[PDB]
Amino acid sequence: AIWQGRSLRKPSGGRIVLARKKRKRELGREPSNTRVAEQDKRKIIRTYGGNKKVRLTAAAYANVFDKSGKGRKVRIIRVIENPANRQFARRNIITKGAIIETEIGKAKVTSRPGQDGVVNAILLE
Amino acid sequence: ARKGPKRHLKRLAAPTSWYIERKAYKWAVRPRPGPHNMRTSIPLLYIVRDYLGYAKTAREARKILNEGKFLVDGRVRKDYKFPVGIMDVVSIPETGEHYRVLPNRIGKLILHPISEEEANIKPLRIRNKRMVKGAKIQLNFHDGTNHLIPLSEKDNYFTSYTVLMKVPEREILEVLPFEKGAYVFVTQGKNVARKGRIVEIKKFPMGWPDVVTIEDEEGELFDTLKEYAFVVGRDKPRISLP
Amino acid sequence: ARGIVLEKIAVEAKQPNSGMRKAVRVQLIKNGKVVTAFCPGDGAIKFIDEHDEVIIEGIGGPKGGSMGDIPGIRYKVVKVNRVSLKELVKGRKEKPRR
Amino acid sequence: GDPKRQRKKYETPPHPWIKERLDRERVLMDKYELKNKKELWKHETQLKNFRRRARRLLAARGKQAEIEREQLLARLKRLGLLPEDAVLDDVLSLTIEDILERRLQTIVYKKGLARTMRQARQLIVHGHIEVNGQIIRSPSYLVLKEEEDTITYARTSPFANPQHPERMMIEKA
RNA sequence: UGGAGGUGAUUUAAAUGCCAAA
RNA sequence: GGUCGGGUCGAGCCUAGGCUCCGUGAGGGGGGAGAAGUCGUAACAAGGUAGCCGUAGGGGAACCUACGGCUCGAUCACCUCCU
RNA sequence: AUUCCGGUUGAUCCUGCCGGAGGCCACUGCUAUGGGGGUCCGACUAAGCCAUGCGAGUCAAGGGGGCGUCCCUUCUGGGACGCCACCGGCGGACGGCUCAGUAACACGUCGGUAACCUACCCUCGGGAGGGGGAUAACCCCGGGAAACUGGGGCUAAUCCCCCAUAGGCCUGGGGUACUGGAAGGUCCCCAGGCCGAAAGGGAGCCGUAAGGCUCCGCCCGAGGAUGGGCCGGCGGCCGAUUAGGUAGUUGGUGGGGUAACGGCCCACCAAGCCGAAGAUCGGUACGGGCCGUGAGAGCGGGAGCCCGGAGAUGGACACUGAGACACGGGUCCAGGCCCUACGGGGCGCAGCAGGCGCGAAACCUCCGCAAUGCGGGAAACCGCGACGGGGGGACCCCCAGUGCCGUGCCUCUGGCACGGCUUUUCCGGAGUGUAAAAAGCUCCGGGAAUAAGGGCUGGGCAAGGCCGGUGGCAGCCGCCGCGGUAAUACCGGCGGCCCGAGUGGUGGCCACUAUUAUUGGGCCUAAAGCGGCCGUAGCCGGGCCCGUAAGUCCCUGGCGAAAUCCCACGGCUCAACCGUGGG
Ligand SMILES: [Mg+2]
Ligand SMILES: [Mg+2]
Ligand SMILES: [Mg+2]
Ligand SMILES: [Mg+2]
Ligand SMILES: [Mg+2]
Ligand SMILES: [Mg+2]
Ligand SMILES: [Mg+2]
Ligand SMILES: [Mg+2]
Ligand SMILES: [Mg+2]
Ligand SMILES: [Mg+2]
Ligand SMILES: [Mg+2]
Ligand SMILES: [Mg+2]
Ligand SMILES: [Mg+2]
Ligand SMILES: [Mg+2]
Ligand SMILES: [Mg+2]
Ligand SMILES: [Mg+2]
Ligand SMILES: [Mg+2]
Ligand SMILES: [Mg+2]
Ligand SMILES: [Mg+2]
Ligand SMILES: [Mg+2]
Ligand SMILES: [Mg+2]
Ligand SMILES: [Mg+2]
Ligand SMILES: [Mg+2]
Ligand SMILES: [Mg+2]
Ligand SMILES: [Mg+2]
C-alpha cells in the first residue's frame, strides 16, 4: 500500500534496482482528514510493538488557552485558513497550524489531531 | 535472524571470556537476560558442571539446581541459564564454601575463594542516578539492580562511587568515593586485573570518555578508562583480591 | 564430452610426412555441433561403427589446440560404447553388443 | 573464503631425474633401509624447517625473538641432536645423517638388539620392543635423549628370555 | 693511410627448371 | 457479512510506435590451407629499365607512367670536403 | 634452490614466442592388503519436476467431561487410581536448506540515536475492589462422492465483556531537584481534555474448626539486560566503438504518516543536484574472516566451517502476534500437475532419505534421543531427519604390511637349496568397548601362511647400439623430429629406469616470465618518439631567515569475534588431531 522505505533515485539522478521485498515495518497508513462536524468521532489503531494511537476523524469541540494559562472547552465554528494545503479551508480540514474560529474568537491549532485525538489551540489577540 | 530473535548459540561463537572447549560439541548454552551483560558473565550450568565438577552431565546438574543447593548473592537460583558476573558471590552452604567471581589477568572469569564473613557483602558501582516520582533518588548499579534514597542525601552519592551492600537484605553500610588516592581494580581492557591508586583524571570535549592514571604497588604508572576502574577501598582494599 | 558418430574419414599428414590418419565426425549431444576426432592406436578404426556413441577429450597440443602433423583436429576418442578404446586396441576386452 | 585443508608434511624434488641427487639418495636408502623415497623426504623437510627457523632468528631482535631462540635450542638438544653447550650458529651445520641416526630402527640396531637393520624393523613392527615401559610400533619414531637407555625387549615378548634360539643368534654377533 | 659527399655518363635481343633426392 | 455510491493504489491483458536478440536465407565478397590445371617473369647481382614512400591515371595478372622525396643503390671519370 | 634446458643458420651472436621440468583443484583409464583423524561427497548444466515415509511440540499443579479398576457405605452416592479427546496457555518468526536476485549504506571498520520498538529474564516501588456473558466437550437430528459443513438443547475456567481506582498521552502557565560535553529529556505546582489494569487463581501441610506457612502464579511504574530498526565518515570490479544525466529531480516553508528522523508522501516558493579525479548506461558477480601459488614485491579464487545478506514455482497483497507480509499458515493473476459420482476439490522437497530429467560430473527410502542444545512443564520428564551412531565412495592428511636370520651354489645386485624364527596383517574364540551393535584395544589356538601395480626406455631427462615382424604402408610425435627392406625412435619378446597402494590422460590457476617491469623491461638499424610547434588541468620545481604543526617520526589509552597460521609444553602408542600459554 503506502511504503516509506527508501527513494528509488540516487542523488546524482541514477535509478536503483530494488533488491528485496517490502518489509511490514516500513508501511504507512491512510491520512485522517479531521473534519468539522456536530459530533466527535475517533478510533483506536493498534501499532508496532502492540501499542496504540487515538485517531480523530471528526471534531466538534476544542481546548483554547490564553497567555495567563487558563483553558476553556468551546465548540468549533469553521476553519478560516490552512497554510498546509491550498484547498483544506474550503473542505474544513483541521491540521496542526490551522486557524479556526470559535465562539470566543480566532485560535491557532497546536496539536496533531491524527496522532493525539484532541484539538488544542492558542487564542489569537 | 530474518524474522525474529535468536534462540541458539554455536560453540565457535561463544564469548571469549569463558573457559570452554570450542570444538568438543556443536552447541552452547545461550544465556538468559539478567543482571550483567554478555561480556562479563557466564551461565550457571558451566559453573556447576565444568568449573567445580560436581556434575558430569547436564541432566544431573539440573537435578542439583532444582533442589536449591546453590546461592548467588544469598538467593536461591534454579535456572541453569542464569548469568553470573563480576563481583558476585557464589555460596554452597551444604559444603560450606564461598567464591567471588573475578576476571583473570588475560580477561577470563575465575572463582576466587573467600572467607564466610566476607561473603555477606557485595560492592556495587554507581552507574547512573536519576530523579523519580515523589521526588526521590534512584541509583542504578553496574549489575542492573536499583536502590532508592531520600532527597536529603542527594549529595552523598555520585556516579563512579562504590557502595558496599549487605546481601540478601540489600542494606547499605559504606560509601567509597572516587577521588585521588582511592584504591581501584581494573575490570576490562589491556590492563585488566591490575590494581592500585588513582593519581590523575583527564577529560575531553564532545563526549569522548575520560581517562584515569593509576600507580601500582611497584610504583609504575598506567592509564585506563574511568569506567573500567572499580573502587574497592580508601587506601587499602576492603575485600580479598588475588 | 559425449557424442554420436556420423561417418569415418581420413586426413593426410602435412609435409614432409606421409600417411593417412583415421578420424571420425562426431555430433555432440549437449548442443548438436559437429566436430572431428582422431582415433589413436594401430588399427583402432576397426572398432568404430557408425551410430556408436563415443567420449572425446582434448588432443593435447600447444595452447590447448592441435598437435603434430595433423592440424585441424583438436580432439581424440577415449571410450566407445562405454568401453575404453585402449583396452580394445590391446585386447583384454571385447566390444559390447557385437 | 575457503575452510582449512590439511597439507602434506614433506616436499618433493624440483626435478625428478638428476643423476647426482639420485645417486646420493640411493646410497642413503640402501644404508638406512627405508621403504620408499617419501619417507626419506619427510626427514629432509624436518631438517630444512630447523634451518629456516635459525636463519629467521639470527636477523631478529626484540622480546619474543629471545624466547623463541632459547626454545629452539632447548628443543634441539632435548632430541639429542646438539651438545649441552651449543649455540645458535651450530644449528646451521646439521646434516641429514644426524636426523636419521635418531630413528627408532637405527637406535635398536646400534644398541645391539638386532643383527641387521631389517631385523630391527621387523622387531619393531611385530611389537617386541618397549620404550620406557610402552610398546611402540612405528620404526620412524624419533627417540628423545632422556629415554634412550630405557629401550629393551618387551617383558611379554618371546625374546625376553636368554634361552630363546633367535636371541642367542643375535647375541653371537 | 683511411673515409664522407656532388655532377656526368654506362652500344640490340637473352624466358623457364624439369626429371631425381624419396 | 451482502448490495449501491465516491476516492485512491494496483499485478495482469489489448492496440500502436520505437530500439534490440535468436533461426533460416536467393545473391555477392574478400581471407586461410592444399597441390599443381594454366598464363607470364614483378623482386633478390647494375636481377638485365636501381629499388622503395606519398598522390593520381592506365592495364589479363604480377605491374607501367607522371610530380615531389629517401639510400635501406652497382661501375667508371672528374671535382669538393676531411683524418 | 632468489635455477634453467630444447627449437630460426652450412656455422655464430641477438630479439622474441612456443614446448619441457614444480604445486593445487574438477572429470577420467588401468590397478588396489590395514588402521586412525578431519570443517569431504547433485555447487558448475536444470532456483528444473517430484510417488511414498518422516523433519514442532508440550502442560492433568488452568477447566468441565467420557471410560475403566478398586475402598466406604452403597437404592442413590462419595472417594482414590489410571487412560482419552475437547476448551485454555506457551511455542511453532529459532533451528535446517540453497546462492536466483543485488554494483547497493549489501558487506568490513570506526562512531551516533538527545530521533526508536522489545514477549520470555533481573532489581526496586505499589496494586489485586464490584458485576455480567457465551460456547467447545456432551445429548437429539443431519447434509455431501469426497474435501468439508448445518440446526436445536446443556455447562466451566488463569476464556470474554463492563463499572471504579491506579495509570498513560496531548497542549498552555510557572519553579529550578537530576544526568550529561551539551536538554524538545527526567522531577515539583496549577489548568483544559482524551485513552484507561489486574487471575488472590492453583497445589501441599498444620488446622476439629477458625486461619496460618510454604511452592507456582496475575496487573501498573522506573531502570537494566537480550534481540533488533535507522543514520554518518572511510575501504574494496571491468568498458569511451557508452559524454552529457536528472524534473519529486536538489533545497526551502507549512503539514501528513511512522515505533522513530527523513522528498518517506502532499500543498506552495525557488533553480538547483551529479560529471573526463569518469556521471549516466551496459557487462559480470552474494560480502568478509580466509584459501591456492610464489624468495619476496605480487598474481588468481572466494561452494563445504563461522559471522552478515537475500529466497521459498514467477508477479502482486493481507490476517494474528512482542516479533512475519510467515519454506511443512491465508488471497488473486500466470503456468504446470492430481482426484472426481462431473456438481466440485486439492498440490509445488532450494528439509532428511529416495525417484525422473540434464549432463563429463555426486551415496542408505538405516538405528537413537544415551551425549551437546532448543521449546514446553513446579518437577520427574516428553519431542526433535538439529545433533549424535553406523552403511556406500581411490575426498584430504597421518602411521604400517606384502616376511626375518644362519650356512652353501649361481650370472653373486638377486635367485635357488637346506635349518631355524615371528604373527603387524589373515582365520576361529574370551574380556572390554557401545543407548544397543559394529569398529578399536588386552589375551588364547593355527600358520609364511592371505597380499604389486602403473608409466617410460633417440635428445630435453634416469634407463638397450639386443632379438623377431612392417617397409613413406601401418603407426609414433607436448616441442625438436622417426618410418622409402640392415628402424637403439612404430608393433611384440627379453632386459633396464622412475615412483610405489598407487600410477597415467584431459581441462583450469600460480610459477617458469624482468613475456606487465613500484622493487625491475624496452623504443638508430629487430615491435615501438605524435610531421612540427604553442599552451589549460595534472605531475615535477633554485638559495637564506622567522612562525605553524596538516603530511612524517616517537610514547601511550580504546578497538579490529572465534575458527584458520608459527613456537614450546601437555593428552590419545608417537603422529595427523585436541587442550593450556606466548606471538
Ligand atoms: Mg562464499
Ligand atoms: Mg625482372
Ligand atoms: Mg627491375
Ligand atoms: Mg601508360
Ligand atoms: Mg635467420
Ligand atoms: Mg538442482
Ligand atoms: Mg524462518
Ligand atoms: Mg547469481
Ligand atoms: Mg475501563
Ligand atoms: Mg566477489
Ligand atoms: Mg554444498
Ligand atoms: Mg539421494
Ligand atoms: Mg566426483
Ligand atoms: Mg621396445
Ligand atoms: Mg641419460
Ligand atoms: Mg611459457
Ligand atoms: Mg623484452
Ligand atoms: Mg618525430
Ligand atoms: Mg616518425
Ligand atoms: Mg627548494
Ligand atoms: Mg602531524
Ligand atoms: Mg581471531
Ligand atoms: Mg601418551
Ligand atoms: Mg606430542
Ligand atoms: Mg586447538
Curated annotation (Swiss-Prot), chain A:
Transmembrane segments: none
Cellular-component GO terms for this entry: ribonucleoprotein complex; ribosome
Single Gene Ontology BP annotation: translation
A UniProt-annotated Pfam family: Ribosomal_S8e
Keywords: Ribonucleoprotein, Ribosomal protein
Alphabetized InterPro entries for the sequence: Ribosomal_eS8, Ribosomal_eS8_CS, Ribosomal_protein_eS8_arc, Ribosomal_Se8/biogenesis_NSA2
Record PROSITE patterns: RIBOSOMAL_S8E
GO molecular function, one term: structural constituent of ribosome
Stated family: Belongs to the eukaryotic ribosomal protein eS8 family.
HAMAP family: Ribosomal_eS8
Subunit structure: Part of the 30S ribosomal subunit.
Protein name: Small ribosomal subunit protein eS8
Gene name in the database record: rps8e
From Swiss-Prot, chain B:
Family: Belongs to the eukaryotic ribosomal protein eS4 family.
Pfam family, one: RS4NT
Name of the encoding gene: rps4e
Gene3D superfamilies in UniProt: 2.30.30.30, 2.40.50.740, RNA-binding S4 domain
Keywords noted in UniProt: Ribonucleoprotein, Ribosomal protein, RNA-binding, rRNA-binding
Species this protein is from: Pyrococcus abyssi (strain GE5 / Orsay)
Protein name: Small ribosomal subunit protein eS4
InterPro entries tied to this protein: KOW, Rib_uL2_dom2, Ribosomal_eS4, Ribosomal_eS4_central_region, Ribosomal_eS4_central_sf, Ribosomal_eS4_KOW, Ribosomal_eS4_N, Ribosomal_eS4_N_CS
Record-level GO cellular component terms: cytosolic small ribosomal subunit
Top-level lineage group: Archaea
GO molecular function, one term: structural constituent of ribosome
Domain S4 RNA-binding: 42-104
GO biological process, one term: translation
Swiss-Prot record, chain C:
Family: Belongs to the universal ribosomal protein uS12 family.
Disulfide cross-links: none
Role this protein plays: With S4 and S5 plays an important role in translational accuracy. Located at the interface of the 30S and 50S subunits.
One Gene Ontology cellular component: small ribosomal subunit
Name of the protein in question: Small ribosomal subunit protein uS12
Assembly and binders: Part of the 30S ribosomal subunit.
Keywords associated with the record: Ribonucleoprotein, Ribosomal protein, RNA-binding, rRNA-binding
GO BP terms, alphabetized: translation
Stretch of the intact protein here: 50 to 147 of 147
Gene Ontology terms for molecular function: rRNA binding; structural constituent of ribosome
Organism: Pyrococcus abyssi (strain GE5 / Orsay)
Lineage, uppermost ranks: Archaea, Methanobacteriati, Methanobacteriota, Thermococci, Thermococcales
UniProtKB/Swiss-Prot annotation, chain D:
Gene Ontology annotations for the cellular component aspect, listed alphabetically: small ribosomal subunit
PANTHER family: 30S 40S RIBOSOMAL PROTEIN, 40S RIBOSOMAL PROTEIN S9
GO process terms (BP): ribosomal small subunit biogenesis; translation
PROSITE patterns in the cross-refs: RIBOSOMAL_S4 (PS00632), S4 (PS50889)
HAMAP family in alphabetical order: Ribosomal_uS4_A (MF_01306_A)
Protein name: Small ribosomal subunit protein uS4
Job of this protein: One of the primary rRNA binding proteins, it binds directly to 16S rRNA where it nucleates assembly of the body of the 30S subunit. With S5 and S12 plays an important role in translational accuracy.
Keyword field: Ribonucleoprotein, Ribosomal protein, RNA-binding, rRNA-binding
InterPro entries, per the entry: Ribosomal_uS4, Ribosomal_uS4_arc, Ribosomal_uS4_CS, Ribosomal_uS4_euk/arc, Ribosomal_uS4_N, S4_RNA-bd, S4_RNA-bd_sf
Record organism: Pyrococcus abyssi (strain GE5 / Orsay)
Gene Ontology molecular function, alphabetical: rRNA binding; structural constituent of ribosome
Family, similarity comment: Belongs to the universal ribosomal protein uS4 family.
Complex and partners: Part of the 30S ribosomal subunit. Contacts protein S5. The interaction surface between S4 and S5 is involved in control of translational fidelity.
SUPFAM superfamilies tied to this protein: Alpha-L RNA-binding motif
